[PDB]
Amino acid sequence: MKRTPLFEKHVELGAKMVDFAGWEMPLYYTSIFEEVMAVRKSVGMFDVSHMGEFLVKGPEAVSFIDFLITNDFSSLPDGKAIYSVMCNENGGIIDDLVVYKVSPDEALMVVNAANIEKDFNWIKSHSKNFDVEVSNISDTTALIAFQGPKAQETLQELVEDGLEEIAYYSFRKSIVAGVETLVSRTGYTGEDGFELMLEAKNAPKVWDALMNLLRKIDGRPAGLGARDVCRLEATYLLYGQDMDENTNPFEVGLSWVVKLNKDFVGKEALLKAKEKVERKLVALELSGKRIARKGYEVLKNGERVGEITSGNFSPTLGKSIALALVSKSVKIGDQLGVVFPGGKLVEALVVKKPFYRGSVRR
Numbered sequence: 283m284k285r286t287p288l289f290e291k292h293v294e295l296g297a298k299m300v301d302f303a304g305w306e307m308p309l310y311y312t313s314i315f316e317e318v319m320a321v322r323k324s325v326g327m328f329d330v331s332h333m334g335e336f337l338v339k340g341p342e343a344v345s346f347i348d349f350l351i352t353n354d355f356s357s358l359p360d361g362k363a364i365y366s367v368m369c370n371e372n373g374g375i376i377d378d379l380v381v382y383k384v385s386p387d388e389a390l391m392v393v394n395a396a397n398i399e400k401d402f403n404w405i406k407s408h409s410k411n412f413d414v415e416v417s418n419i420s421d422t423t424a425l426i427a428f429q430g431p432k433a434q435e436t437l438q439e440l441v442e443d444g445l446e447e448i449a450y451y452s453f454r455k456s457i458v459a460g461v462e463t464l465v466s467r468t469g470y471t472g473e474d475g476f477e478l479m480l481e482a483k484n485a486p487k488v489w490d491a492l493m494n495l496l497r498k499i500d501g502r503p504a505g506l507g508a509r510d511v512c513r514l515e516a517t518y519l520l521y522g523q524d525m526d527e528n529t530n531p532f533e534v535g536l537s538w539v540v541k542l543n544k545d546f547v548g549k550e551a552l553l554k555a556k557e558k559v560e561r562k563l564v565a566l567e568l569s570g571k572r573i574a575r576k577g578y579e580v581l582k583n584g585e586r587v588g589e590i591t592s593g594n595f596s597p598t599l600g601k602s603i604a605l606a607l608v609s610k611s612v613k614i615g616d617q618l619g620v621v622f623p624g625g626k627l628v629e630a631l632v633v634k635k636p637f638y639r640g641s642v643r644r
């Protein structure tokens with residue numbers, strides 16, 4: 283499996299490993315529960331160096347990105363990032379991503395680990411009519427997520443610049459633990475937090491420095507188990523599970539990242555799709571302790587309406603929770619049935635999204 287520059291640190295910490303998107307990653311160090319509460323009460327640090335980073339440089343960096351993504355990148359000022367999806371000609375979701383507007387001539391794209399190759403090829407195969415050069419800097423770039431209500435107060439003593447000045451989804455170049463870093467107020471937890479992008483060679487040092495500060499405030503390094511629990515509670519999507527090229531943005535609740543007033547790949551397809559949204563992604567709270575898995579059929583009074591996309595147990599709400607792609611007719615308050623292996627039906631209630639909102643800003 284592929285190993286991030288912090289693999290050795292995870293091994294030393296005695297973490298239980300799991301294969302994620304071809305990477306040997308830490309599922310948890312102590313327990314998924316302990317790590318989730320760390321994110322919810324103080325701070326949890328995640329190694330997300332498996333994520334990819336693409337750099338677009340050139341006079342038409344802005345128009346190129348705007349042509350590729352569904353969201354409005356043309357308006358974004360320097361130092362701002364934006365969440366979005368990148369669609370194919372038929373409006374299917376190729377991947378969701380975050381794009382940083384460094385300057386008129388430079389943009390950085392952060393994409394999912396499993397889609398690095400696919401995304402990069404897609405992006406390169408579309409640079410032809412744009413005065414830009416696209417490069418993949420994933421191989422030498424690390425990314426650390428420092429999340430929690432006490433994330434800012436704990437991280438600040440190692441950062442050369444003021445963090446309070448950095449707004450939600452804003453970023454800046456600074457120095458952390460003596461090394462250059464692109465610090466952003468972003469996250470996948472629903473709490474306040476930051477992500478630290480840095481040269482891979484510097485990952486171990488920054489990580490060690492941060493670990494030292496965590497043991498002081500009862501914080502903890504957190505694995506993928508805790509990462510999934512927190513994002514699901516926050517009701518954030520995971521490409522490959524909650525959506526893929528067979529779903530358009532409107533079907534999974536991402537209408538807000540699609541700006542149809544501009545031209546972009548999949549635009550025409552989406553105009554027609556928007557007129558007939560027959561599916562929606564709903565939040566479910568199941569009875570019992572059994573956890574739903576992707577693919578389990580979802581029923582309404584004995585009739586199928588969809589299927590589970592993501593499932594896990596939320597210690598924050600103390601319930602088995604799930605996301606499910608179902609027919610438009612499903613509404614909040616509905617009583618549904620999730621079919622577990624062996625045809626065993628488990629009751630589930632449709633609830634207003636998101637399940638939980640923490641200290642995350644703006």
Ligand SMILES: O=C(O)CCCC[C@H](S)CCS
Nearest residue numbers: 300302506507509510513520
């Ligand atoms: O391995 C697991 O059990 C799932 C955790 C997946 C981690 C997060 S939810 C995805 C990274 S974008």
